[PDB]
Design a protein around this ligand. Structure first.
Ligand code: A60
Lengths: 99, 99
């Protein structure tokens, strides 16, 4: 599909039994999801943006479905105000910028 | 162009005769540039990112050429970690997401 940018590029994602709305975010290196108690091993990380840093948990090889497209990879989890699909998964679903 | 996302979508912009590198950021509502001088009136504003809120200077109707495409719109100047082109100007240059 083609998503214009007149509004925030929010799409439906699924991670296990949770459907969520998330931004398709070319400015994010890695996917960051709102706090959720995912199973499995993780490592602490701090990620930085406007306003400073937040602490997140890095989970690897997590399957996520994004608008019906399958992805699997690193998912950061922490107190972000918005769910963010970053470049690590945008490439897996075939997403490009075009102008 | 078509821009894939295996690397950061950094592009050269021209603003006030100056060449800068900026990140095409679909998860940003607004265009935010690192500290720089711009002419004319500005308004104090605050904006929030992943790590909290910052103070910025809001300049309206500023021309920026983004990868050869002309925009004229609002530019916020302040302590962003990197220069970002947000949706306010991505829409003007006809940028969409495609997958
Ligand atoms: C270092 C480059 C940017 C910050 C500049 C990185 N951000 C993604 C960005 O798209 C963010 C994503 C974002 C969206 C909404 C809330 C927080 C973050 N947007 C953002 O800060 O936009 C601000 C400018 O316009 C405004 O509209 C949205 C917030 C304002 S981020 O959220 O801080 C971020 C950093 C690291 C990872 N892995 C994932 C995300």
């Amino acid at each position: 599909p083609q998503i214009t940018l007149w509004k925030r590029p929010l799409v439906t994602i699924r991670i296990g039994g949770q459907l969520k709305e998330a931004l398709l975010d070319t400015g994010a290196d890695d996917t960051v999801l709102e706090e959720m108690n995912l199973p499995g091993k993780w490592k602490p990380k701090m990620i930085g943006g406007i306003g400073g840093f937040i602490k997140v948990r890095q989970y690897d090889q997590i399957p996520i479905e994004i608008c019906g497209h399958k992805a699997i990879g690193t998912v950061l989890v922490g107190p972000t105000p918005v769910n963010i699909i970053g470049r690590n998964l945008l490439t897996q679903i075939g997403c490009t910028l075009n102008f």
